[PDB]
Structures are given as structure tokens and as C-alpha cells.
Structure 1
Amino acid sequence: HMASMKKKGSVVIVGRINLSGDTAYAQQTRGEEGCQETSQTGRDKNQVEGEVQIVSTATQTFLATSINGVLWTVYHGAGTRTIASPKGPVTQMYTNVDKDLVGWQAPQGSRSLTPCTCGSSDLYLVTRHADVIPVRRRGDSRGSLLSPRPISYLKGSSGGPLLCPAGHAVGIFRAAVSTRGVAKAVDFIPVESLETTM
């Protein structure tokens, strides 16, 4: 009945992939209990840093990547959810189910990647475990792993970046292409689609 209808919680930043130095590594900034509470209130006063965030809802965890002042992620992770922020929940400024893409204004303190203009096909995928995986671009939205891995290795990394050798953003990781459970290729949202969506 109408009186009892519930509200879905916000997406919550729970950590980041640290790429600032010589070694990439995941950092957690909020535990599961505090995540649950923050999703309900939508109020997150934690300091945000970096380009690649680890994000969670009550039921899923994945990544989000700042490019040109927008924190981007996948619709299959975030749906239409707000993101928690210091002043309460923030509505998406981009939503495109056809591209599996959503975006919010980038949090204060985040740093943004620059869209790639290199035209290079030697890419790097950053996972939620801070693995930096070489990927050869094979089309507008496809790349092959130089070393295939079980899909388990990639699960939870949608919303993460594919980068060029210079560290520019080339795309947002969307889906794995698997045969017999092995990811030989990845599907990604090209940065040009983001730049157009914008």
C-alpha cells in the first residue's frame, strides 16, 4: 500500500583505486555497516580523492570513474539511484539505459581523467582489485585481454576505466565477453559516447 512504499537507497562511495604513485592498490574508506546507513540517508561526509571510486548499493558493488568533471558508472549497477554526498542525495545528471551509462556531478575532492585523443589501441583496464590489465583495442567498443582470465576476476569492475598509455580515459568497462567462463574480451562504453551524452 502507498503508506509503506519504500525508497531505494543511494549509491555510496566505499573506497577508491589508488593510482597516484608507482603502485596501484585498492583502499576502503567506509565499511559495510556505515555504507548501509549512508545509502539510506544519502548523506556522506567522507573525503573523496582520486579518479576511480569503489561504489556500493545495498545489493551490489562496482566502480565509478571521473572524466571531465562527471562521475560515470553503469546503469546495471546504479539504476536511476542518487549518489550520497555531504549535503544529501544527488540526482543523476546523465542516464542512458541504451548505453548502460549513468553519471553524477563529480564529488568535491575527486580528480578527473582527460578523454583520450591519441587514437592508440594499446589500452589498460583497471579493476576493483587494482589490477592493471593490458587490453588490445579491437573495435569501437571491444578489446581483447592479452592474458585471458576467468570472469570472476573482472566481476565487480564495471564502471572502471580503460586507459591509453598516457593515462587518458578511453572508455568505461561495461561487460565481459566470456567463453566457458573465460574472459577473452571486454565490452566498454567509448569515451566519445560520454562526450556526446554530455
Structure 2
Amino acid sequence: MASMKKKGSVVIVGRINLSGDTAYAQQTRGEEGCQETSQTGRDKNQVEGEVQIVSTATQTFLATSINGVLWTVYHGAGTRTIASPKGPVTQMYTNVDKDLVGWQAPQGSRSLTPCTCGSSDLYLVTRHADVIPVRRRGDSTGSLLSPRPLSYLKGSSGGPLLCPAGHAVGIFRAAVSTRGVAKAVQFIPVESLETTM
């Protein structure tokens, strides 16, 4: 019981840059470094942007900042802390029934704003910065306009689904697939984010 360990913190290893001409993923911490920043929690690298790429010692996914909170998904993060300059940081929101968790948006970062103009055709940002047209077919669901394998959507949970203007409509959570070809998607409607707040 003395020779016991603890599940390290979630570490920011990069970001999906969207603030210019094109969308592209940037790496900020290697694998050997992330394996350490998760064991300590002391993350010195400053934060920029809205969509961050996060990793645990065994998995990797995304996290989106909205209304001043860095949201992600529970099945990737769990109750883990996040590495901040001032050590680990406890989540200020945890709802397993929704598969949702959140930390205070670190400084130096920007937080999207919920879309209030009614989203019709959404755009899903993937782990590899790809922007995939989604046709909102529900309140938390959206069919894909172009079919592609599930393998290109794995590790994208916690990412954003965006208005044509760029506001946030939800948080990619699960995928609807048949025969290995993803046909639709589901997300956490940003209104439920507000309700949790």
C-alpha cells in the first residue's frame, strides 16, 4: 500500500489552430515529455487557442474551451486532474451521465461562444484539423455529408462542432457507424454545457 501509484493528470500535448487562413494541428509536447508532465502536473508551456489536444498515459483526445471552461469527455479523462503551471487542477464540472468534464480555461487561451443564431449545417473539427461538414439531424446528432471510416474520427471526441460563423454548437462525443463506415455523429449540445454551469 506504500508502493502504490496514482492515475496522472491530463496533459496538453498540442492544439488545433483555427485563427488564420487554414486549420492545422500543432504539437507542443513530445511523448516522453507528456509521460512526465502527467506524473508531475507542472505544465509550464503556455496555452493558446480554443481547441487543445490532450493525452493520458494510455489514451488521447481533444478538449474545447467554451464560456471560460475547458470542456472534454469523461470516458477519455475520467476524474483526472489537468497539468497547470501551478500543479494539477481539479475539475469544476463532472457529469458521467453526460460524459462531460471541465476545467477552468487556462490563461493565455481563448474560449468560443455558444452559437445563438441557430446552427443549420455544422462543421466537425477532427484530431487532424480536418473540418467535416455535418448536417444537423437532431438536437445532439448530425449526419455526415461525406462517408469515411471510423478510424479517422477516433481520438476526436471532446472536439468542437461549429456554426458556419464559427460559434460552438456542441462537443463530439460518439459516432454512429455501420460496417465500419461512419454515417452520423452525436455531440453534447452546448446548451447542456450551460445547464451544468
TM-score scaled by structure 1? 0.98
Give the conservation status (yes or no) of the 8 Å contact 2:119–2:169: no
Report how many aligned residue pairs link the two structures: 197
Question: Structure 1 residue 10: deviation in Å?
Answer: 0.2
- 1:109 is displaced (CA, Å) by 1.1
Tell me by how many angstroms 1:120 deviates. Answer: 2.2
Deviation at 1:148, TM superposition (A): 1.4
**CA deviation map 1:150-193 (0-9, x unaligned):** 00010100000000011000000001101011111001000000
Question: Which deviates the most, 71-80 or 114-123?
Answer: 114-123
Output aligned runs, 1:18-33, within 5 Å. 18-33=17-32
- In structure 1, runs of 5+ residues without a counterpart are none
Identical residues among aligned pairs (%): 98
Q: CA offsets, 1:34-58, max 9 Å, x none?
A: 1000000001000110000000000
Q: Do 2:61 and 2:158's aligned partners in 1 also have CA atoms closer than 8 Å?
A: yes
Query: 1:99-120, CA deviations, whole angstroms, 9 ceiling, x for partnerless residues?
Result: 1100000111110000011112
In the aligned structure 1, how far is the partner of 2:31 from the partner of 2:188?
Answer: 29
Instruction: Give every structure 1 segment of 4 or more consecutive aligned residues whose post-TM-superposition deviation is greater than 2 Å.
Output: none
CA offsets 1:102-147 (integer angstroms, 9 cap, x no match): 0000111110000011112210000110000000001111001110
What TM-score does the superposition give when structure 2 sets the normalisation length?
0.99
- Say what the alpha-carbon RMSD is for the aligned residues: 0.6
Task: Give 3-state SS (helix, strand or coil) of 1:118's partner.
Answer: coil
Separation of aligned partners in 2, 1:156 and 1:40: 22
The whole-number CA distance in structure 2 between the counterparts of 1:4 and 1:188 is 40
Tell me by how many angstroms 1:6 deviates.
1.2
Q: Unpaired segments of 5 or more residues in structure 2?
A: none
* In 2, Cα distance between equivalents of 1:192 and 1:120: 12
Give the Å deviation of 1:5: 2.4
Equivalent residue runs for 1:1-198 within 5 Å: 2-198=1-197
Q: Deviations over 1:33-92 (max 9, x none)?
A: 110000000010001100000000000010000000000000000000000000100000
User: How far off its partner does 1:4 sit?
Assistant: 2.1
Question: Which secondary structure does the structure 2 equivalent of 1:102 belong to?
Answer: strand
